[PDB]
Amino acid sequence: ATAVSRPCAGRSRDILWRVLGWRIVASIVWSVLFLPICTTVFIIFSRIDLFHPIQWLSDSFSDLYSSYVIFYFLLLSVVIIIISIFNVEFYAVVPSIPCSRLALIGKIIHPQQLMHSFIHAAMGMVMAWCAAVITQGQYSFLVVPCTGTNSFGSPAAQTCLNEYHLFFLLTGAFMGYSYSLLYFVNNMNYLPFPIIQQYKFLRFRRSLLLLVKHSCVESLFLVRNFCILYYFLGYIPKAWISTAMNLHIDEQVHRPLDTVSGLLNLSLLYHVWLCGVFLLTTWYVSWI
Amino acid sequence: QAEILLSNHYTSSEIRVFGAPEVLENLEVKSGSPAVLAFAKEKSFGWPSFITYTVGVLDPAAGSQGPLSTTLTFSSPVTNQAIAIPVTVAFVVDRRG
């Protein structure tokens, strides 16, 4: 039992796969084919020095061909494939307009639009993890050995929670949630057809320059909003993760990011903004 | 042994405390953590006089939460003498990191 009596619920979708299936596959392939152009640009913008520009370019290529960047590129291509697939669940041919404020709240609280904001928060956290390992140094890992424990007693290598890697991951989660919220609030999922059809290369060469300008401004607003959110809540994920893994805090080497005199660090703010520009640009390239 | 390391590949170690026979007769042992134990294997009162203690982990799950370092103190109330040895416990799901 029981495969009978519903052949039209094939045929109605099967014509949709004749007409649209190869258009979806070509869109997914092009979304992955732009990812190397986004990761090269992300490394070249995170490696910037202004005094030794020949070494800046040298060592950006030294990372680019490194086996860890090749692995995280393969993880990031799976993330971009999955984001391209969720644009195939959530698209609309008619805009889902809320005729009251309660209708807008009821749209945001709809269980699939909630599922999409949880899944985008997870994909944003994974993309921020890949980005934090690609930026190396103090960003590289969630756990670091205690940086001052010269107190002879206990040859156990004690471990601290990396609050800057936690800030990276949690910004990624907030950006992914915010993108998915914006996607349904602005009706970005709507497919307005063009009054003027145009060859794909021109139709993309005209939009990409508007997108990179949008990503730079929207990442700056999302980092600004996340900095205000962390100043009132950062301690809660921090104290939960330190207790859940029995990790310490190096209050002698690192200033905590609950403090304005740690959180205003321009290097962290730039690398987290650049991560948000890579995130928004790759996700909006799949959408475009 | 001046310090002890316990792991997947060394689940116990065997340390000798040397002394005079009366001081070794009355030799207590005290661990800084209940996850690490020591038991007397053999006493020798013939020169050079010693006791071998087999030292080991009672719970590998305590040894999995991180590098558990503790001390093992051997003490003799007859002379008020003590010797304290560091013990590191490190149990790992090993490969490349």
Swiss-Prot record, chain A:
Cytoplasmic side: 1-23, 89-113, 186-224
Coiled coil residues, start to end: none
Superkingdom in the source lineage: Eukaryota
Cell compartment(s), UniProt: Nucleus, Nuclear pore complex; Nucleus membrane
Perinuclear space side: 45-67, 135-164, 246-271
UniProt similarity note: Belongs to the NDC1 family.
Name the record gives this protein: Nucleoporin NDC1
Gene: NDC1
Section of the entire sequence shown: 2 to 289 of 674
Swiss-Prot record, chain B:
Tissue and organ expression note: Ubiquitous expression, with highest levels in lung, liver, pancreas, testis, and ovary, intermediate levels in brain, kidney, and spleen, and lowest levels in heart and skeletal muscle.
Compartments reported by the entry: Nucleus, Nuclear pore complex; Nucleus membrane; Endoplasmic reticulum membrane
PTM statement from Swiss-Prot or TrEMBL: N-glycosylated, but not all potential glycosylation sites may be used. Contains high-mannose type oligosaccharides.
Role: Nucleoporin essential for nuclear pore assembly and fusion, nuclear pore spacing, as well as structural integrity.
Family to which the UniProt record says this protein belongs: Belongs to the NUP210 family.
Further remarks about this protein from its record: Recognized by antinuclear autoantibodies in primary biliary cirrhosis. Knockdown of NUP210 causes nuclear membranes to accumulate aberrant structures termed twinned and fusion-arrested membranes and nuclear pore complex to cluster. Induces cell death and chromatin disruptions.
Self-association and partners: Forms dimers and possibly higher-order oligomers.
Name by which UniProt lists this protein: Nuclear pore membrane glycoprotein 210
Species this protein is from: Homo sapiens
Phylogenetic lineage: Eukaryota, Metazoa, Chordata, Craniata, Vertebrata
Gene expressing this chain: NUP210
Part of the whole protein covered: 1695 to 1791 of 1887
